[PDB]
Design a protein around this motif. Structure first.
Motif, mmCIF file in Angstrom:
data_model
loop_
_atom_site.group_PDB
_atom_site.id
_atom_site.type_symbol
_atom_site.label_atom_id
_atom_site.label_comp_id
_atom_site.label_asym_id
_atom_site.label_seq_id
_atom_site.Cartn_x
_atom_site.Cartn_y
_atom_site.Cartn_z
ATOM 1 N N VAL A 258 -25.828 66.886 -5.134
ATOM 2 C CA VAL A 258 -26.442 68.279 -5.286
ATOM 3 C C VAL A 258 -26.840 68.864 -3.929
ATOM 4 O O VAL A 258 -27.021 69.987 -3.964
ATOM 5 C CB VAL A 258 -27.639 67.993 -6.108
ATOM 6 C CG1 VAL A 258 -29.069 67.927 -5.488
ATOM 7 C CG2 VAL A 258 -27.547 68.755 -7.485
ATOM 8 N N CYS B 115 -27.704 62.405 -5.787
ATOM 9 C CA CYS B 115 -26.875 63.122 -6.920
ATOM 10 C C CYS B 115 -26.260 64.021 -6.781
ATOM 11 O O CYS B 115 -25.606 64.944 -7.749
ATOM 12 C CB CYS B 115 -28.615 63.946 -7.322
ATOM 13 S SG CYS B 115 -29.860 62.944 -7.630
ATOM 14 N N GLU C 277 -32.908 61.787 -16.544
ATOM 15 C CA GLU C 277 -32.483 60.947 -15.464
ATOM 16 C C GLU C 277 -32.823 61.784 -14.413
ATOM 17 O O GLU C 277 -32.273 63.053 -14.350
ATOM 18 C CB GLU C 277 -31.336 60.199 -15.628
ATOM 19 C CG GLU C 277 -31.272 59.420 -16.903
ATOM 20 C CD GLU C 277 -30.287 58.120 -16.811
ATOM 21 O OE1 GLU C 277 -29.035 58.672 -17.031
ATOM 22 O OE2 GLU C 277 -30.584 57.197 -16.385
ATOM 23 N N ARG C 278 -33.197 61.029 -13.441
ATOM 24 C CA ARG C 278 -33.181 61.918 -12.001
ATOM 25 C C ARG C 278 -32.189 62.835 -11.745
ATOM 26 O O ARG C 278 -32.283 63.993 -11.414
ATOM 27 C CB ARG C 278 -33.418 60.942 -10.979
ATOM 28 C CG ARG C 278 -34.088 61.568 -9.494
ATOM 29 C CD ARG C 278 -34.237 60.605 -8.541
ATOM 30 N NE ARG C 278 -33.047 59.579 -8.098
ATOM 31 C CZ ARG C 278 -32.314 59.789 -7.203
ATOM 32 N NH1 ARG C 278 -32.446 60.948 -6.471
ATOM 33 N NH2 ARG C 278 -31.295 58.885 -7.029
ATOM 34 N N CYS C 279 -30.872 62.356 -11.460
ATOM 35 C CA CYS C 279 -29.805 62.927 -11.064
ATOM 36 C C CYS C 279 -29.520 64.149 -11.950
ATOM 37 O O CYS C 279 -28.904 65.316 -11.637
ATOM 38 C CB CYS C 279 -28.527 62.299 -10.421
ATOM 39 S SG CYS C 279 -29.290 61.360 -8.774
ATOM 40 N N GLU C 280 -29.639 63.661 -13.329
ATOM 41 C CA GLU C 280 -29.233 64.511 -14.496
ATOM 42 C C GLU C 280 -30.052 65.611 -14.377
ATOM 43 O O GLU C 280 -29.536 67.037 -14.488
ATOM 44 C CB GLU C 280 -29.373 63.894 -15.563
ATOM 45 C CG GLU C 280 -29.104 64.663 -16.753
ATOM 46 C CD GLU C 280 -29.442 64.157 -18.353
ATOM 47 O OE1 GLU C 280 -30.624 63.122 -18.158
ATOM 48 O OE2 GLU C 280 -29.048 64.341 -19.275
ATOM 49 N N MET D 77 -37.816 68.811 -7.841
ATOM 50 C CA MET D 77 -37.761 67.391 -8.244
ATOM 51 C C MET D 77 -39.199 66.839 -8.362
ATOM 52 O O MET D 77 -39.487 66.211 -9.159
ATOM 53 C CB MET D 77 -36.770 66.809 -7.565
ATOM 54 C CG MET D 77 -35.363 67.252 -8.029
ATOM 55 S SD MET D 77 -35.068 66.985 -10.002
ATOM 56 C CE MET D 77 -34.685 65.155 -9.818
ATOM 57 N N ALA E 8 -31.654 67.109 -11.496
ATOM 58 C CA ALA E 8 -31.119 67.875 -10.223
ATOM 59 C C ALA E 8 -29.885 68.619 -10.566
ATOM 60 O O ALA E 8 -30.023 69.700 -10.113
ATOM 61 C CB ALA E 8 -30.839 66.497 -9.215
ATOM 62 N N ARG E 9 -28.851 68.155 -11.020
ATOM 63 C CA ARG E 9 -27.878 68.989 -11.214
ATOM 64 C C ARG E 9 -27.992 69.859 -12.326
ATOM 65 O O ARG E 9 -27.502 71.184 -12.085
ATOM 66 C CB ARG E 9 -26.430 68.179 -11.841
ATOM 67 C CG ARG E 9 -26.061 67.126 -10.613
ATOM 68 C CD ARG E 9 -24.967 66.444 -11.165
ATOM 69 N NE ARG E 9 -25.169 65.666 -12.344
ATOM 70 C CZ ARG E 9 -25.096 64.307 -12.060
ATOM 71 N NH1 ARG E 9 -25.515 63.995 -10.673
ATOM 72 N NH2 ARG E 9 -25.552 63.801 -13.192
ATOM 73 N N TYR F 79 -35.745 62.370 -3.670
ATOM 74 C CA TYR F 79 -35.699 62.759 -5.096
ATOM 75 C C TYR F 79 -34.570 63.405 -5.307
ATOM 76 O O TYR F 79 -33.995 63.345 -6.730
ATOM 77 C CB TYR F 79 -36.943 63.934 -5.459
ATOM 78 C CG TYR F 79 -38.354 63.324 -5.220
ATOM 79 C CD1 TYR F 79 -38.662 62.444 -6.308
ATOM 80 C CD2 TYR F 79 -39.022 63.643 -4.185
ATOM 81 C CE1 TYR F 79 -40.116 61.911 -6.136
ATOM 82 C CE2 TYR F 79 -40.251 63.247 -4.200
ATOM 83 C CZ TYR F 79 -40.770 62.345 -5.091
ATOM 84 O OH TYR F 79 -42.078 61.711 -4.971
ATOM 85 N N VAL F 80 -33.749 63.997 -4.458
ATOM 86 C CA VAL F 80 -32.253 64.325 -4.759
ATOM 87 C C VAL F 80 -31.316 63.494 -4.014
ATOM 88 O O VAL F 80 -30.005 63.717 -4.128
ATOM 89 C CB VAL F 80 -32.070 65.693 -4.304
ATOM 90 C CG1 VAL F 80 -33.086 66.815 -4.932
ATOM 91 C CG2 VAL F 80 -32.402 65.923 -2.716
#
Length: 130
Positions: free
Chosen positions: A130, A128, A4-7, A29, A9-10, A124-125
């Motif tokens: 981040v 998140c 998943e996107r934020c997953e 990203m 990113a972290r 994209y971030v």
């Protein structure tokens, strides 16, 4: 694995990608999004030159990883290409950091030039943490 996107990113943040060789996380990203849709299992065979692109960053078998069937392979990451199809992306990240130590940097991926260069890539971030 499809991240998943934020997953993702972290995970990249933890793996030291933010600002690596001057490249922000939002740029990494944008690259993974357009290369694979954040899918570690992605492969793309290039019939014209007989090479294959592997994993979440679609790293190529001629210059970077070895799959045994590509003519002219260099294996600059000193990695089997199968290491780039794992759910755990630590190896794909160490090889992606090797790709951008070359002068061209992230411009090595033409998909980053087409979809991310000179665009606002902060969505994209966003969110998140981040």
């Amino acid at each position: 694995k499809v991240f998943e996107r934020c997953e993702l990113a972290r995970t990249l943040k933890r793996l030291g990608m933010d600002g690596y060789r001057g490249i922000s996380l939002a740029n990494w990203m944008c690259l993974a999004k357009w290369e694979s849709g954040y899918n570690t299992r992605a492969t793309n065979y290039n019939a014209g030159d007989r090479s294959t692109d592997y994993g979440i960053f679609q790293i190529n078998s001629r210059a970077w990883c070895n799959d045994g069937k590509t003519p002219g392979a260099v294996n600059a990451c000193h990695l089997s290409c199968s290491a780039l199809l794992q759910d755990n992306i630590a190896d794909a990240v160490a090889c992606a950091k090797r790709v951008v130590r070359d002068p061209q940097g992230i411009r090595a991926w033409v998909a980053w030039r087409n979809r991310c260069q000179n665009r606002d890539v902060r969505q994209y971030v966003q969110g998140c943490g981040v």
